[model samples]
Target: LRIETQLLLGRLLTRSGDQAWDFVVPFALLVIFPGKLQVAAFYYLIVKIGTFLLTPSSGKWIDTHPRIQVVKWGVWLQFFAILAGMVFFGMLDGLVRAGGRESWLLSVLFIALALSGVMASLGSQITDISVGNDLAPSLVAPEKLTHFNSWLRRIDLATEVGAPILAGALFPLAGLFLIGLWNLVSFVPEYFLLRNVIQRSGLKIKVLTEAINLRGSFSDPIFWLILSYALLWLSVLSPHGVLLAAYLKDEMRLPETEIGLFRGLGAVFGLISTVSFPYLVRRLGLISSSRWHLGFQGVTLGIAVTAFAMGSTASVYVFLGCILLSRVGLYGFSNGEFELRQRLIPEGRRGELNSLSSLTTTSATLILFSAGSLLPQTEDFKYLVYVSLAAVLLANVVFIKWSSR
Candidate 1:
């Protein structure tokens, strides 16, 4: 297979596994502890905080290690991490069924679940930066970057569209253990496919030794870019996000299959953005392309918020419809964001800066989840939607500032 084919195939396998695992975890937790939004939110809060604490060091590690080595480590780590998660989940399933939620053993399993979830998050992040930001730019010709980037995104959105649907169908029959096993099986091919891409590309990138800056300065343009993206992370209006998923399941009384289809439908809009982004970037350039997309997202989400506030039966679907449409803008903006960050960051510090960006985003997610845990009721979800809209608008403002510079 060609290098491009291998890269895309590798991403397809890894992302399909990742998307399904991510989609199932929250629902699995809810299955054991029904109608408990705090359980899911609090569990993820731990994962985000753990990711927050460890993210700083990961950047330095990626910077100092060979990229191929980093990918191998990430793949293996993810395999074991999810294995741990599956074991804990299986234990919790049996224990909870046998009267264990009030047991100390339940607490123990919950803690183990969170820890392994964080490890899985770290592994995914490492591979994402190594392959998407670092290796792709190094291997592909500069002129073909947008084309490759779009394909990368198309692969992601394709899986995003299918993986949840697959998980949804499987969950009723087998629960999340089967999904975790599927994920474990995927790492073998994912590792080899990515490894082959690097070995066959004929690019031997040596590990760089340099002075590292763990703390980022506000003066750096990357800081503003990071800030812009981080602000967007503060929102819970995302169609596929846990908060909204919980809301639909618990509040709107939607079935699991319908919710999964809804999530997949959102990704279909995201796929449209991948198609449109390259055309927009060619005409508007990165900054304007991102700016207009951000603007579009803000407008659509604003309307969704308004519909939510109306609180009617018809209005609920209206709000969901708008949220689905907003994915186009959100993913389109992200595509531009990825390209801009790739071009702007110096190669030596790509890992550090990328990790810093991850840290920032995780911090925002932590704050969002903290608030979510405190206000865990279905009725309280509307306020989070308002805050999400505000966050999007604020992100747009920050991006405007970054673009003007």
Candidate 2:
């Protein structure tokens, strides 16, 4: 509480830096190796497969050890990966030259960098979430959670807009070497600032939860809550990213740039939605507000279905309102729901829960994303609107009738 602004500023900087690299490195990789996205994606799958294990691992690491080290070095993994990648590629290009099986060595370095890069990101994300959730008692008043969270959510929204834009400019203007160096170097000040806040706070970084027995975990309220939420991921939101893009490109017949603008348009409204989140949470309380927001999301999915079917290219802006409102609902739910979930999770088990939830979502998205790939590539995507509508509405019904109580 004493170092509220300091803690927040450091957290924001780290969050901003993480997101900026997230957009930058991926795009840079594509530009850096244009015809190799499929190959990159192959290893990216390995990265995602490595996902669920780390959240709990992160919890265990940070708790058994120290939060500062966990965060500082989690970040360092990414920095090291980028630095290593540059060196490895440089070596392959004949500056240092290689031995026999040189191409094989290059392949190994690529996979290693991809593995470390993705795992480091996973570790960083897991650390941030657990640590941020842990910050509540020490960082701010419990009653001020929504207000605090609103500010944080706004940071997320701002980064959502700014990071991609920054990545665009940073790479184009500065080139990949400096851009990679920029992301790598930016970590130093951020590290010191966060470290300072942690030392000054004079509190244990986080508490260890007793290892949750699996049988016991199933009986816990949080387990069921997590399971219910995972169902939403599986049934409703699973195919969102690809489904939306396919719909935009195929149904709307928009060019790639226009499609980018359309998605960016949604993100802009997403920002506006997050800006209004605290007020919404304040007015309705987090749970009730999230429920209504989901209800609206259900409604919008239905509208999106009809709009995509009936609207012409020229007339398509009509459903833009629907998409905008859906985006708002999503941002609003995500902003409030995460804060609410974080509050309820025990610090000791936060990592486990986070990882479990992530695993569930990842599994669902992998299945649905793959399935959507097999669909007819246009109207078939609309079938998912029905799936989302049903799942979301069902979530509401279950929450009201069972979970929320």
Candidate 3:
């Protein structure tokens, strides 16, 4: 109970920081730099670079370090990083409100916050891999790791669903600094209770020397398949951060609050699917389940994009339903894929392999983020839907072919 509470609190804190970003960044950009797609694109680029450069090393560190200690410290790093980001953003907002060189001030704030995000991301990678490794031994027996991971993902999605709404409500009353303050407070249990659990476990702390030796995961064919699939998966999803809002507001003529509600609904569906996926995978087999899921995702993407482009009311709901369905497939396939990877990889090498996976996902995300930025923001942004649909279709083709072989 103590450990679970601590971990849950840590996740809550992390999600708070993310929620703050989701509220402030886009809102600020829209208000202050209206129509400047490049700024948003730049933010994605920095995130991509940070993930690409730091994730591999972080992964290696997790595999080598004492899992508990690494997780403990990583949580601390995330806490402070979020605190610093909130402070910086607060200052920028104040300066802009005061008419003190708004453009340069906002730019500086964006860069600082992005860097803080990088720090938090590194810590996140550490904690995630360590938790997975620590849990693997017990999880392997029943092959319920997929279910366990799915539950975790659902928790994350639930938090994400509430986060933006809460941040938006809080931002006006408490200001952004208060959001960070809340995060700091939430992190306290993570540091004390979770750290104690790690200490009592008496797990030997693996060092960098031991971790570095297990770096040959690239040679595995399964790793490549997973990587390819993840790349395609993220590519399809990346536009949601940048393009979806525009589509909701301009294309569908929906209010911003309604957009948030739809997102929350989608998250709820995703959470349900994630929790149910493990049992489904157990019955279907990993490869077979993943292929079916991917094929469905591709079809859904195609249908959703087509509906959005057509600009019809019935098509809009169809698109929305398809989006929700795609999330189901996505979370289900991801849970199964990760569990399979864990089963295939040797115990000692899990960290490195997991890190490699993170690296691949982040790199793909960065590319897509940049692509999203480069596109013109118009009612015609529906073109991106078509592009994304094609990308997923191609990915499905490759995945199906590989599965057949």
Candidate 4:
């Protein structure tokens, strides 16, 4: 299991690196097609909507199939998807560099790139469900599911934190093709080492059968709690992608490298929060941790928005600090909520529940990305900051009150 876990982690990191490359393309588009936020927003919406729809079905399928089978197929599919994305991005970059009518030809290239996202989403869902179902039994005790899940989350946080920096370094230096090639190479071991594992014989239902039977998962208060937590996190995260980068560039006149560095720091802070979560939960109790988590997130987001509004060179560091601190709170709450959902939900039903949770979260992210794209790009964008903080504050209050009950 440990070996398999490590293999799984490697595969996840590679996939994440691919994701980092994919995300950077939009920023590049923003640069290439200056002021064309509508196109960027539309592309972002389509990719995320594809992710949202594909994820649930992939999860349900993994739960039904053998774990080894799912892992093997998912890894291979990801390898090819990354390759496809790399080619598509390379062609797009070429079009952008070329003069005349072909200059905007990159728009046509985006279709292939967008389809690659569907493949990646399917692969990701398979891995998520397999890991939760196959690994959870040994890693977590019946009562300690949340704690164990927190550990897994720390691993996830660490990967997410590191991947963007790796991508930022790779993309400019070696280009998208090289990054995709690296992802493909990294999956080689997972393909070989992951064989010979015992497959689970339980739960052989079809997708529709499982979906219908699992409908009751929606009725669980824990599901609602988890969904609410996801919403708050999404509200906080919405501004960070394109908006935050633009703010850093326009307002502070920071270079792209520095912005990447700052965002990387935020990822590291999130990892630290994940590592600390299990102990914090033990010390404060889950409910108290949840309250503190929400409160801190709300406060930190407020501080970040304030720093952004100030818009001085020195304020960049302040803004970075606030953003990192906000991530710490966000991950703490996220780690706790994921663990709680993992623990409370039945083992047999975990894949479906996780799918539901992921679908909800991804859908929210899609909506936010659309809004971020549509909103006017000006210093007045600070209003997004205000709205995000207010939403999180309300969420915090509600979560704390509910936990008390």
Give me the candidate number with maximum TM-score.
1
Clashes of each: 0, 1, 1, 0
TM-score of decoy 4: 0.76
Q: After superposition, how far is residue 3 of candidate 3 from its true place, in Å?
A: 6.2
TM-score of 2: 0.83
On the 0 to 100 scale, the lDDT of residue 289 in model 1 is: 82
For model 1, the stretches where C-alpha displacement exceeds 4 angstroms are 30-37, 94-106, 172-175, 210-213, 217-219, 241-264, 303-321, 376-383
Global lDDT for candidate 4? 0.65
lDDT of 3 at 328: 73
RMSD of each: 3.4, 3.9, 4.0, 4.8
Candidate 3, overall lDDT?
A: 0.65
Model 3: residues with Cα > 4 Å off, grouped in runs: 2-22, 25-41, 93-99, 102-110, 133-142, 205-208, 211-217, 234-241, 248-261, 305-314, 377-383, 398-405
Q: Across residues 214-307, which tens digit of lDDT does each residue of candidate 1 receive? A: 5453456788888888888788887767778898888778788878887768768888898777888889877888898889889999999898
lDDT (Cα, tens digit) per residue for candidate 4, span 226-311: 66676674453432466778866887788989887776676577667765666677888776776677678888778877876776
Candidate 4: regions farther than 4 A off: 1-20, 23-42, 87-109, 137-139, 142-174, 191-195, 199-217, 236-241, 245-264, 302-320, 401-405
Q: Whose lDDT is greatest here?
A: 1
lDDT (tens digit, per residue) of candidate 3 on 116-146:
8778767766666665545444224435556
User: lDDT tens string, model 2, 1-405?
Assistant: 346665567557766666776665555555435567765566556666666455446545554555676567756665676677556544433322333333666677667666766666675665565446665544667667776666677677677678867767765214556556666676666567667777766554455444323444445566545544554564323223656666767777778786676666766766676556666677877777776666676677567657756767765665656766776666676655567567777766555555556655676656665565466466676667567666666655655554455
TM-score of 1: 0.86
